[PDB]
Amino acid sequence: GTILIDLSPDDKEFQSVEEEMQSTVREHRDGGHAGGIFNRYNILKIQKVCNKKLWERYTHRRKEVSEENHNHANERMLFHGSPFVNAIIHKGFDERHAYIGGMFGAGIYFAENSSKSNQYVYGIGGGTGCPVHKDRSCYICHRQLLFCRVTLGKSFLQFSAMAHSPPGHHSVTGRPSVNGLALAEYVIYRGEQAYPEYLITYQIMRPE
């Protein structure tokens, strides 16, 4: 059911997606251990992910959340990095894409910082890095992130340094409470609350 449509770099939609990728890079407390050392990316391709059935599954659930929250879905566009990006774009998000050991419990994790989602592209903690060179900071191999439409509804605010939502909430927000430069991370507990709208193929760039 999934088709991928390439965006032209001249397309304003390519440009606005690239800009959210680039402008949400930050330094990480592991010194680049999980995701590598870089201040920016080389964007190779941006594709729109089109699947009617998965879209309708998303919008069905979005309406449900919206009616439970004074007609406010509290929809965001957020990054997701995963070893399973290929399964996700073809079959949707579900429990097999959950971060069982995540700090806000077993759910599907998203980030405002593209560089945070980058840390998960090759697995939790970056795994063993790229399959070809075993390098978590590989500047050669092609990486992929998803830029996703995510329904948060009523989000439980956790201040801080698969399962269910907390009662009366549709998601969890992990608010950064130590690293003043960190953006928020979010967790949903239902695959139907995200749609993987853009597939972004890129390299991290070695700083000069």
Ligand X SMILES: O=c1[nH]c(-c2ccc(Br)cc2)nc2ccccc12
Q: SS3 of 173, please?
A: strand
Site string for ligand X, 123-142 (x = CB under 6 A): -x------------------
| Cβ–Cβ < 8 Å for 152, 186 | yes
**Which is closer to ligand X, CB of 112 or CB of 192?**
112
138 binds, among ligand X, Zn ion, none (CB under 5 to 8 A by kind): Zn ion
* Break sites following residues in the chain (C–N > 2.5 A): 161
**Which residue from 3, 132, 157, 161 is in contact with Zn ion, where contact means CB under 5 A?**
132
Q: In whole angstroms, give the CA distance from residue 138 to residue 73.
A: 38
Under rule CB under 5 A, residue 52 binds Zn ion: no
Structure tokens at 33: 């251990």
Under rule CB under 6 A, residue 116 binds ligand X: yes
Under rule CB under 5 A, residue 130 binds Zn ion: yes
112 binds, among ligand X, Zn ion, none (CB under 5 to 8 A by kind): none
Q: In whole angstroms, give the CA distance from residue 203 to residue 208.
A: 15
Under rule CB under 6 A, residue 110 binds ligand X: yes
Residue 148 annotated in ligand binding: no
Per CB under 5 A, which region of 82-90, 98-106, 137-145, 179-187 contacts Zn ion?
Answer: 137-145
Residue 138 annotated in ligand binding: yes
Q: Shortest gap between Cβ of 62 and ligand X (angstroms)?
A: 20
Residue 130 annotated in ligand binding: yes
Structure tokens at 182: 């960190």
Q: SS3 of 194, please?
A: strand
Residue 50 annotated in ligand binding: no
Per CB under 5 A, which region of 3-11, 17-25, 123-131, 156-164 contacts Zn ion?
Answer: 123-131
Which DSSP letter does residue 39 get?
A: S
What are all long-range contacts of 67-71, with beta carbons under 8 Å and residues at least 24 apart? Answer: 68/153, 68/154, 68/170, 69/153, 69/154, 69/170
**Which residue from 53, 133, 164, 206 is in contact with Zn ion, where contact means CB under 5 A?**
133
| Cβ–Cβ < 8 Å for 196, 206 | no
Annotated binding site for Zn(2+): 130, 133, 138, 141
Point out which residues bind Zn ion (CB under 5 A): 130, 132-133, 138, 140-141
